[PDB]
Design a protein around this nucleic acid. Structure first.
Length: 81
RNA sequence: GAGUAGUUCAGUGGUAGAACACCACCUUGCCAAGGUGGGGGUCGCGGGUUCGAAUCCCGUCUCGGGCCCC
RNA sequence: GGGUGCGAUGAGAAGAAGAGUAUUAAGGAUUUACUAUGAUUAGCGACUCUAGGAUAGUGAAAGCUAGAGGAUAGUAACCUUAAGAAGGCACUUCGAGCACCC
C-alpha cells in the first residue's frame, strides 16, 4: 500500500537500512516492491517473516520511493513505528 | 590585407612551432587535479625563382576594406 | 528581501577508505630508459657511425627514412630513513536543504 507509506510517521528507505532496522526489531511494518531484484528482496522478506512482522508486496519500486519522499524508488522500505 | 595541427595563435629564405584539446602510462573501484611522454599538418590551390619557399615571385580561390592596392 | 541549478535516483554533515599513497626536503646504489646540450672556424643548419638517399654554396664531415653507439648534466624508474595530503561515487552513520547572482 503506497498510501500507508506516503503517510505514517517514522519510515526508513533502502534495503540495507531496512535490514539493519530489522536487526533491532524497532519496525512496525515492512513494504517491499515486486519488480525489484529478488536477490535483494528475498534477503529482507526472510528476516521480516522470521521476526513475525507483516510483509507487503507492491508493484513498482519507483512509485514506492516516490511515496517515501524519494526522487527515485526504493527496492524496500520499512515503517518503523 | 586576412588563409597554417581538431581549436585558438606564433613563425621576414633554413628543423613545421607553442598552449588547449586528444591518446597512453604513472593509477588494480571509477572520474577529476597533477606528473610523464607520445601525433597530427595539402602551411587555401597550382606554378616559377631557389640549394632550400609557410616566407619571394606568377596565376588563381575564398574573404574584409579602400581607391591598382591594402 | 530579491533573478537563475538541483535535491531521500540522498541535499547537507561526520566517520571510515584513499594512506605513511601522490608529494616536499636530505640520501645510498651506479640502474636502464627519458629530455636537454656537443670547443674554435665557413655556414641558416652538425653528438658519433652505418644502409642508402642529395647535393648550389658553405664544409674535415650536411637538412632526408631505418637504425645502432657515445660522452656529459638533469628528470625519472630500484631501494634507505625523517616529515604526511586531496575532490566525486560506492561502504557506515546522520538526515532536507545546499550552491551561482544584486
Amino acid at each position: 500500500s503506497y498510501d500507508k507509506v506516503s503517510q505514517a510517521k517514522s519510515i526508513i528507505i533502502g534495503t540495507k537500512q531496512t535490514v539493519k532496522a530489522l536487526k533491532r526489531g524497532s519496525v512496525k511494518e515492512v513494504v517491499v516492491a515486486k519488480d525489484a531484484d529478488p536477490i535483494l528482496t528475498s534477503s529482507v522478506v526472510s528476516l521480516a517473516e522470521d521476526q513475525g512482522i507483516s510483509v507487503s508486496m507492491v508493484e513498482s519500486m519507483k512509485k514506492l520511493g516516490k511515496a517515501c519522499g524519494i526522487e527515485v524508488g526504493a527496492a524496500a522500505v520499512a515503517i518503523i513505528l
